[PDB]
Amino acid sequence: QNLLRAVSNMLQKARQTLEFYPCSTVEACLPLELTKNESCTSFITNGSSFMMALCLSSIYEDLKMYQVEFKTMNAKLLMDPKRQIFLDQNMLAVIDELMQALYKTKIKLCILLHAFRIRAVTIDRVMSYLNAS
Amino acid sequence: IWELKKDVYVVELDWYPDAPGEMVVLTCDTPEEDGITWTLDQSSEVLGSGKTLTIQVKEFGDAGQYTCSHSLLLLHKKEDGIWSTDILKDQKEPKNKTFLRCEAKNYSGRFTCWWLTTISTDLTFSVKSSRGSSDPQGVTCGAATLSAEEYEYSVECQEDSACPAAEESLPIEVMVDAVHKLKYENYTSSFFIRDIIKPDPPKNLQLKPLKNSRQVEVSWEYPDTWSTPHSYFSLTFCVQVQKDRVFTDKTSATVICRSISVRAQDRYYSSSWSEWASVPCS
Numbered sequence A: 001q002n003l004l005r006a007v008s009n010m011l012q013k014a015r016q017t018l019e020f021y022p023c024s025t026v027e028a029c030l031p032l033e034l035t036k037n038e039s040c041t042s043f044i045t046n047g048s049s050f051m052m053a054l055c056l057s058s059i060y061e062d063l064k065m066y067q068v069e070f071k072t073m074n075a076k077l078l079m080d081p082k083r084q085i086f087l088d089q090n091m092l093a094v095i096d097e098l099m100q101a102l103y104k105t106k107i108k109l110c111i112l113l114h115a116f117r118i119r120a121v122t123i124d125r126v127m128s129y130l131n132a133s
Numbered sequence B: 001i002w003e004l005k006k007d008v009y010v011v012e013l014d015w016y017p018d019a020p021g022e023m024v025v026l027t028c029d030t031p032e033e034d035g036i037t038w039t040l041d042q043s044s045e046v047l048g049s050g051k052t053l054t055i056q057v058k059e060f061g062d063a064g065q066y067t068c069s070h071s072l073l074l075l076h077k078k079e080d081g082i083w084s085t086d087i088l089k090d091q092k093e094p095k096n097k098t099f100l101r102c103e104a105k106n107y108s109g110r111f112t113c114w115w116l117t118t119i120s121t122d123l124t125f126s127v128k129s130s131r132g133s134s135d136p137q138g139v140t141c142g143a144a145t146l147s148a149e150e151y152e153y154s155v156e157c158q159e160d161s162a163c164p165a166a167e168e169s170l171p172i173e174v175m176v177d178a179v180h181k182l183k184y185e186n187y188t189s190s191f192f193i194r195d196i197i198k199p200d201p202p203k204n205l206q207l208k209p210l211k212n213s214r215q216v217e218v219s220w221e222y223p224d225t226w227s228t229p230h231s232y233f234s235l236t237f238c239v240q241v242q243k244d245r246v247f248t249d250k251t252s253a254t255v256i257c258r259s260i261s262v263r264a265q266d267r268y269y270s271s272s273w274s275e276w277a278s279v280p281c282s
């Protein structure tokens, strides 16, 4: 739960500052209840089985993809004496923590901060559904 | 020169006085050849004759219900490079040049859009929508309407085969056709449902004061229209008494009395808070 907050603060911070930056996990972890709806055959349930590990495995793969992306970027980015900044180091730390528990270039970065926010959100939703009760 | 709806056309014109008009040609759709007459509606003057009337458009008077088949001409103004936005009011507020405003009550795929005009006379409005452009996806919209009086119109749409859990990555586009008299404008709005959410208010608050305490236990429940499962579609709630607020994602909180209100917010995207829900502190 010290994790959940780390994830949630990164999301709040992405949410607050992403404007100042220009420019299948969803199903594998689909909630049982959303199954009753035509347009959404695995699922997970309020309790948090092979489906379960599929979901988690999927989340974990997603994170590995992003972890590489962020480290590569951060390596390039280090040449900008403005050193690095922070949302990406935030996202990265959360990625690392989650994994354990389980100009041209400045544009490529904008694009990514965005793509991951959308995805940490999903991860955060399944994680929150899995506590619930 | 193009076709809007059935038997209606739009003529795009640089509104500059010195700019060329369009040499327009109205083929009378009625294969009868014969010596044929040509008029502009209530206009008695047989403006032309034959079969294929032909004319110079450049002014509104040059626009109208021509008659021989039917043929309506509406004009699209263009000034200094930009199309006219006369018929509607720039609600400014959101981002300037914001004519169409939308809102969603949840991730259902359903949403309302509304706009403003100063007009009251002839005013027709068309409305279409889809998700994506280079390979659109279906959205079904209802019909434009007087909602309140500046006069306000709104419409309702529903994304078609919509999974509330779907990550959005191509925005929804709403297209609006406006025709005030003989003038033709058209508006456009692009958004992701997650950005336009405004949820209904917290449902049924409750106090549950405790002995040895001026401190109360306030509670409520998710509004009926919100998305389920709730733990997946989290709302964050602000709990106020009247700073002294309390932010939580739980459906209760502990305050101190002396009223008590609660509003909701998507947990992740749209910041639009829900209308307050209150209760008397005593």
Ligand SMILES: *[C@@H]1O[C@H](CO)[C@@H](O[C@@H]2O[C@H](CO)[C@@H](O[C@@H]3O[C@H](CO)[C@@H](O)[C@H](O)[C@@H]3O)[C@H](O)[C@H]2NC(C)=O)[C@H](O)[C@H]1NC(C)=O
Pocket: B001, B002, B012, B076, B175, B177, B186
């Ligand atoms: C909103 O207003 C704009 C500007 O008036 C509309 O753009 C214009 O759309 C028409 C219809 O697509 C284009 O007309 C011509 O259609 C023929 C088809 O027979 C096509 O082959 C030609 O290439 C030509 O596009 C017109 O060119 C276009 N304006 C321009 C020149 O950019 C727009 O369609 C309106 N939105 C709608 C459809 O509600």
